[PDB]
Amino acid sequence: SIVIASAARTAVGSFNGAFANTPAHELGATVISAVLERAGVAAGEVNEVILGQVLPAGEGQNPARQAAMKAGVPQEATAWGMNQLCGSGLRAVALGMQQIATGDASIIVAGGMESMSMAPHCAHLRGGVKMGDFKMIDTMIKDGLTDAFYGYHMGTTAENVAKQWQLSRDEQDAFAVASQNKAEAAQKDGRFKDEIVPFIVKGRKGDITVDADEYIRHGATLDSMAKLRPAFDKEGTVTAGNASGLNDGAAAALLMSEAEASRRGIQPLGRIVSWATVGVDPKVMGTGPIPASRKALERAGWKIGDLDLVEANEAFAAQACAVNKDLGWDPSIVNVNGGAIAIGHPIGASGARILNTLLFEMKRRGARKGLATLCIGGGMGVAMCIESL
Amino acid sequence: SIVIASAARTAVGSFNGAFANTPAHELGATVISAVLERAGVAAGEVNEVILGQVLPAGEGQNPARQAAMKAGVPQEATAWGMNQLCGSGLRAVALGMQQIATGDASIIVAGGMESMSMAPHCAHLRGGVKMGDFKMIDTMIKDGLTDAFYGYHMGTTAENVAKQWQLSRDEQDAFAVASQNKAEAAQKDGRFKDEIVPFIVKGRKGDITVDADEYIRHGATLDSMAKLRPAFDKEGTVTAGNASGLNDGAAAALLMSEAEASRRGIQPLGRIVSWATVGVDPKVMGTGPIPASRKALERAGWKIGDLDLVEANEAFAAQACAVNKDLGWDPSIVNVNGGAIAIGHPIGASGARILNTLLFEMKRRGARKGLATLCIGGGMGVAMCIESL
Amino acid sequence: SIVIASAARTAVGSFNGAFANTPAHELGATVISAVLERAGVAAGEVNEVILGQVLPAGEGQNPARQAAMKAGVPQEATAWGMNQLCGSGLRAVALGMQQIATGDASIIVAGGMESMSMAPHCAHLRGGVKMGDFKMIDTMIKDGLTDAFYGYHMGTTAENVAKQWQLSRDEQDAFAVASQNKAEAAQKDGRFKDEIVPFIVKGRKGDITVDADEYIRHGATLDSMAKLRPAFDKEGTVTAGNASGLNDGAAAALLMSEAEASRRGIQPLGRIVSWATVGVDPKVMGTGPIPASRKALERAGWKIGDLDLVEANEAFAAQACAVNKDLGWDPSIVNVNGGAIAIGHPIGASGARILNTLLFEMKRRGARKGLATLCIGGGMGVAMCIESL
Amino acid sequence: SIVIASAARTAVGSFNGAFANTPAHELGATVISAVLERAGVAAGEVNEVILGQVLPAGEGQNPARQAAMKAGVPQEATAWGMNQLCGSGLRAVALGMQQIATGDASIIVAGGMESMSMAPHCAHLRGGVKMGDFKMIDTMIKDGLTDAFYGYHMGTTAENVAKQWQLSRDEQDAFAVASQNKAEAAQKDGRFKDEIVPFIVKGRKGDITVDADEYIRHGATLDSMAKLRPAFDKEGTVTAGNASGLNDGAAAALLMSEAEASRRGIQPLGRIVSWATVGVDPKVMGTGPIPASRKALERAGWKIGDLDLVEANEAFAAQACAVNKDLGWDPSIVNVNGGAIAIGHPIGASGARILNTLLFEMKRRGARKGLATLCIGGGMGVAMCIESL
Ligand SMILES: CC(=O)SCCNC(=O)CCNC(=O)[C@H](O)C(C)(C)COP(=O)(O)OP(=O)(O)OC[C@H]1O[C@@H](n2cnc3c(N)ncnc32)[C@H](O)[C@@H]1OP(=O)(O)O
Ligand SMILES: CC(=O)SCCNC(=O)CCNC(=O)[C@H](O)C(C)(C)COP(=O)(O)OP(=O)(O)OC[C@H]1O[C@@H](n2cnc3c(N)ncnc32)[C@H](O)[C@@H]1OP(=O)(O)O
Ligand SMILES: CC(=O)SCCNC(=O)CCNC(=O)[C@H](O)C(C)(C)COP(=O)(O)OP(=O)(O)OC[C@H]1O[C@@H](n2cnc3c(N)ncnc32)[C@H](O)[C@@H]1OP(=O)(O)O
Ligand SMILES: CC(=O)SCCNC(=O)CCNC(=O)[C@H](O)C(C)(C)COP(=O)(O)OP(=O)(O)OC[C@H]1O[C@@H](n2cnc3c(N)ncnc32)[C@H](O)[C@@H]1OP(=O)(O)O
């Protein structure tokens, strides 16, 4: 029924690094043209562009429409942004699948984009401040990384799961090192090259082509990992080294019925067999993926053991270990090329970034059944099962 | 197959008016609870909440999830926000319907919410400003009302459509006055009572219950209308009087299969027969509804003549006249109780606001076929056809 | 040797009141024009303009020169601002006197101006804020009213003075109320008309002439003052009622040698016999007037008992009572037309505002010896003796 | 009559350089302690502290007093800041002299301090911004470098002066390069060591001692000056290389009667023989020094040819050449150790910084008569004559 004809993602930038002054719709446009080019589909055949994006403050009207127009998709197609926090990227793909499944569209470009670097500071000032100091709020932290129910950071929610699952520092640290070493190993062997579409950082005193994940760290040591101080709980266990980072990036998929891809002679990266989204306690939002994955598997008619490859988003080492511990899937087939701790976590783009890595790894090793899943702030999980053809 | 079991909207606040300090999710909570109580469905039975919202800067992580939790939808449910600018409120409902249509959900609350008053001022300040003044940008203007491709305001787009359609000042003014007069009549006659759920503005020095659309102007004259100066084009034709305003509000609908409503004893407000979204030139974005309405009639298998009631959002008199002129529907069945010029236009909530208006008027006059449509900044239209049961 | 030929002040405005959006330099230029007019002196004869001013942030290069240029003082004269906090308006007069006493000028305009309403919020942003919320600081509080050594408000130094002199709430409120009733009666009787020069607040939708002190409360009651909550110490004694307010105004004096005023046939408002400035502990800065008045009296060769009238500025009733208790002057000759609790406290202007008040009352009742004195944040006092000719 | 018993200055910091986060009062405190130590005068004997400062926004209540307290000056002493823009640090000395001349003080510490790096960005937000962007104003530019009458930067006044005196790019550049070459030669030979007092930048990760002017460029080339583009008039003649910079620093002098220096066995740096301040057209502010120096010499009884050494502040090479051309003093006795284009221009402190340079060079070469003068924004000049004893 619905297949991902092609896919592409930019490299994931570090915070205030290579994409520091790049609006997310510019990386979005590059990724949208990439998918088109890759499948051999003309921009004019796109019905709609669906892009998850959690932090658009200051970017102007509907950045998803700006991305589409800049990538050549005519003014006749439509475009919209959506937010389901970290799940956005993946959710958007399911939403475009639904556009086709109900017969409302033929071809959708879906994924997410995000510029955490470009997220601005703000204040509500229409009433005015008659007397006294007032806070300038960092919208990336307020609107993207702070739980709205308990007022604390995602990091504390990770601590909640750490304590609850009795996941020691050394255990999270071990997990972190492995994702670095695995992300570094994969990048060195050219395993991220099919998925990445170089992005040209338009300069003045030089244009720069970015085609490598700059957030991965080469030669990560356990010693350096164990000397870092806890970033959220002063006598905590979560640190900067075992937590994902603040990053920029964009990732997308080209969707169409399976019959359509056959009419066009396209070899699809996979069929979307199912997807799902379930809520959980906001305090332990990191557990999100447990219920959602299970549901997704139930809806696809598959067992956990049927999965050949898995991409479970690395928000925090504590949550990742808890996910894997509970689900019990074989660790060796999960984040084979490294995860968000090494790669990065451009919130609104991450769900599509991990779908790209899944998709191109599944083709590369010939795996048939796959699943991508992410935890979501506010206590939610999103999962999707993909099957190759 | 999918019906609108119940619906509710808060009154529409004036800018920095009744809801001046009310966060959009608060307005949404109340509309989530209203739709739930008006259909007899428990919050625990809600699977997902979808809320169109264009300006959430600074409201924290995913205001839709905040709204849902505040209203009592359990943490096991899911929520998300989406942005197709002005069509957001209506598109949510279509998106929600698709959730049930693909069997991924049973019961959904969809609509939109917006606090234009609470939109903050922002600046990207991570680099630091070594020297020189910098701009604190109004996200309301920048992210909600400015065309991202031509840099001008929506009002200019309206001017483009007036010139194009040769719509004179007097003819735009005549439409505005009638909109005010129909809204005022409607309000005096208790015609907005069913759809409105009174909202309690939690005070300190007292609570204030708001149950009336405060932006409608009583006794609007043609003289006062003709004295106003053009707001966007210095020697233009669009004024503050013949353009909608800046406003706050929320509206939603409770969706479920026709079968499910039947199992429950609910008498639905309507069956969603079709919906459609189409793009047009950003410069003449107000023509959006033409192609969109036509596409949705096509998908429903209806002729324009088949409609008994229409709600075509009045962003600007010049675009509303163009639309009506083009489509040729009977003016007498369009915005029977007044439109956005009088009622206001809380961006992300406006499509759900007009769906409420349509739906309660179809039940009260016994209309069978109705259509709701809105122009969208960036150059898009959205439309939905509803049939009574 | 040096006399005050004439003086003028603007009415004192309420915080964000009649001069809510009037830069201080506009209020200062009207006072410069009035002192000139009053003395029969032309703006081309002024050598230098000296204006105390504590909060000039954002008003642009040297506001004293902006006021001087606006008044028509030639470009060949000079002008400068100074800041000895609340004693500023009075210390500028002392400093203007000194220019003439040393032969460096013949004609000086000296006093103060302040727009507390127009003070801005600020932040040091050159280095950049990598991430996190940051404070926008009210410059009026931080630079005008917070002690820099102890970090608390001037209000807390008043509580310190209340404890140490054992001043009860009741005694302070009675002083406060008498301050209001004396001001009201001298306002109603027209005793502020001579000193005040009307200020024209330039409208758009109408020019407004301001010629009355608007912070003075009419029919102030003991009861409503008694009911107020402490404002600085949750369980203190200083309240908004018995403390001075936040205000806007300007005030000045025209100076020249006695011999010069004699050549011109000018009947001066008085001779500056002496002045003094002395420091005290910043914790009890309200006590400043004690050592400073004793020193000005000593330098004049006068006993406390030789004074006929006194203007002892009312920062807080706690400190005014203390000052009066220690000096032991007859209370009936102190602030006979009310004081700053009623009239207000536009920080840099205050010392010249009370000087104007002293001057015009000395002329009206034929008082021969007077003194003006103020307390100063930071732990200082300033006083000036004046004798009539 | 009045002498300068001792003097000291901190090295001049580069913009956002060595003193990037050092509040001005900390730099002033080290210079007050240096002057005391230098004169064998204890802080308990100081009567008053007078500090020129143009941009104190956000540093808290009267920074002059903060500096004085930090240096141990007793709370019984007084302190104030003043602002005659660029003339401030020199005016402070003339005003402190006046304190003593009139018998109100015996011992004064007077000069200036400025942290242009710490000046903040601000906005008047008390009335609120109902809608539309607002500017965050750079207080350094607005309040220190922008002319309030014509709206343009001090650099445009320099273009006015270059046009009017027909100073070519080439001649300004040759003046700029010799200013750098002379300051560098003086720094390398140890000539700034007597006047500089080392300032310790209290760090966390290490304390840094700053005792070298860091803005002076070594091996400055004419070629590099010539290639620069005009900074203020796109087709102008003033550039970043021929203009002074934005800088941080403090400087002062300790003052007492000549008879009191004699009682103490102090060998003073000089006798203040006269000073003067005169205005000029704001558009040609740079010419300030002409009438002020001519008036100061007149008051001294000196002809221009009587001076042995001159410090004429180099705001811009255009105005410094105009001054020199008009006055006609032998250029080889002016700014013999380089001037502000090389050393820097910490607005409020500059006048005291060049007074320190004059004094210590007069003592080294045995120069008997000197003069220090500066141009001032808003159209003013200040000058001081000094004779050695
Ligand atoms: C459901 C969900 O998915 S919710 C999650 C959505 N995203 C999040 O919740 C946020 C996760 N990320 C964050 O919030 C941030 O990245 C934080 C708070 C963990 C870290 O923020 P910062 O302190 O600004 O990060 P930063 O990159 O500076 O880390 C600090 C240091 O850790 C070091 N570090 C990080 N990883 C490693 C590692 N593997 N090995 C060694 N050093 C490391 C960095 O190199 C840096 O060194 P430095 O101090 O010399 O610069
Ligand atoms: C696809 C699309 O939908 S795009 C549309 C999305 N929304 C928009 O595009 C914006 C349209 N609305 C706007 O941008 C604004 O409301 C504007 C620019 C037209 C007006 O903004 P403002 O100038 O701040 O509006 P405001 O309410 O002050 O109008 C000014 C005056 O007009 C008067 N006025 C307005 N309507 C009338 C009337 N019918 N009769 C008499 N006077 C009237 C107001 O009462 C007011 O009088 P006042 O100056 O004494 O207060
Ligand atoms: C050495 C030196 O001079 S330092 C002194 C320099 N100035 C200062 O130190 C500060 C003194 N002033 C202040 O800081 C402020 O005015 C404060 C903190 C005391 C009050 O600030 P606010 O709380 O914002 O003042 P505000 O005007 O709102 O007073 C609150 C209320 O008291 C009421 N009130 C004040 N005086 C009276 C009175 N005499 N009778 C009855 N009610 C009164 C006001 O009407 C107001 O009523 P409301 O809440 O219904 O509006
Ligand atoms: C009365 C009165 O005194 S009014 C005067 C008060 N002060 C003023 O009016 C302002 C004077 N100064 C200024 O406004 C500023 O210094 C300006 C606008 C001229 C320059 O500001 P900026 O552009 O930010 O200065 P900046 O230090 O970056 O200069 C730019 C470049 O010129 C280069 N430059 C400056 N001088 C030289 C030189 N002598 N040789 C070679 N290069 C030089 C700098 O090295 C820098 O190179 P980069 O771009 O690789 O960094």
Coordinates of N, CA and C in Angstrom, one line a residue, chain B residues 174-189 191-192 216-217 220 310-312 314 324 330-339 342-343 365:
Chain B
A174 N -19.1 48.1 2.0 CA -20.5 47.6 2.1 C -20.5 46.2 2.6
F175 N -19.6 45.3 2.2 CA -19.5 44.0 2.7 C -19.2 44.0 4.2
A176 N -18.2 44.8 4.6 CA -17.8 44.8 6.0 C -19.0 45.2 6.9
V177 N -19.7 46.3 6.5 CA -20.9 46.8 7.3 C -21.9 45.6 7.4
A178 N -22.2 45.0 6.3 CA -23.2 43.9 6.4 C -22.6 42.8 7.3
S179 N -21.3 42.5 7.3 CA -20.8 41.5 8.1 C -21.0 41.8 9.6
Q180 N -20.8 43.1 10.0 CA -21.0 43.6 11.3 C -22.5 43.5 11.7
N181 N -23.3 44.0 10.8 CA -24.8 43.9 11.0 C -25.2 42.5 11.2
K182 N -24.8 41.6 10.3 CA -25.3 40.2 10.5 C -24.7 39.6 11.9
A183 N -23.5 40.0 12.3 CA -22.9 39.4 13.5 C -23.7 39.9 14.7
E184 N -23.9 41.2 14.6 CA -24.6 41.9 15.7 C -26.0 41.3 15.8
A185 N -26.8 41.1 14.7 CA -28.1 40.5 14.8 C -28.0 39.2 15.5
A186 N -27.2 38.3 14.9 CA -26.9 37.0 15.4 C -26.7 37.0 16.9
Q187 N -25.8 37.8 17.4 CA -25.5 37.9 18.8 C -26.7 38.3 19.7
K188 N -27.4 39.3 19.3 CA -28.6 39.8 20.0 C -29.6 38.7 20.1
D189 N -29.8 37.9 19.0 CA -30.7 36.8 18.8 C -30.3 35.5 19.5
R191 N -28.0 33.6 18.7 CA -27.5 32.6 17.8 C -26.1 32.1 18.0
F192 N -25.3 32.8 18.8 CA -23.9 32.3 19.1 C -23.9 31.5 20.4
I216 N -17.2 42.2 17.9 CA -18.3 42.6 17.0 C -18.6 44.1 17.3
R217 N -18.7 44.9 16.4 CA -19.1 46.3 16.8 C -20.6 46.5 16.5
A220 N -22.5 49.5 13.6 CA -21.5 49.9 12.6 C -22.1 50.7 11.5
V310 N -23.1 28.2 3.8 CA -21.6 28.4 3.6 C -21.0 29.3 4.7
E311 N -19.8 29.0 5.1 CA -19.0 29.8 6.0 C -17.6 29.9 5.2
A312 N -17.4 31.1 4.6 CA -16.2 31.4 3.9 C -15.6 32.6 4.7
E314 N -13.8 35.5 6.4 CA -13.5 36.9 5.9 C -12.2 37.4 6.5
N324 N -16.7 35.0 -3.4 CA -18.2 34.9 -3.6 C -18.6 35.2 -5.0
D330 N -25.0 31.7 -3.6 CA -26.0 32.7 -3.1 C -25.4 33.4 -1.9
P331 N -25.1 34.7 -2.0 CA -24.6 35.5 -0.9 C -25.4 35.3 0.4
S332 N -26.8 35.2 0.3 CA -27.7 35.0 1.4 C -27.4 33.7 2.2
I333 N -26.7 32.7 1.7 CA -26.4 31.5 2.5 C -24.9 31.5 3.0
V334 N -24.2 32.6 2.9 CA -22.8 32.7 3.3 C -22.6 33.6 4.5
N335 N -22.0 33.1 5.5 CA -21.8 33.9 6.7 C -23.1 34.6 7.2
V336 N -24.1 33.8 7.3 CA -25.4 34.2 7.8 C -25.4 34.9 9.1
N337 N -24.6 34.6 10.0 CA -24.5 35.2 11.3 C -23.3 36.1 11.4
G338 N -22.7 36.6 10.3 CA -21.6 37.5 10.3 C -20.3 36.7 10.1
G339 N -19.2 37.4 9.8 CA -17.9 36.7 9.6 C -16.8 37.4 10.3
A342 N -16.3 40.9 11.6 CA -17.0 41.3 12.8 C -16.5 40.5 14.0
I343 N -16.5 39.2 13.8 CA -16.2 38.2 14.9 C -14.7 38.2 15.2
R365 N -31.2 25.8 11.5 CA -32.1 26.1 10.4 C -32.5 24.8 9.7

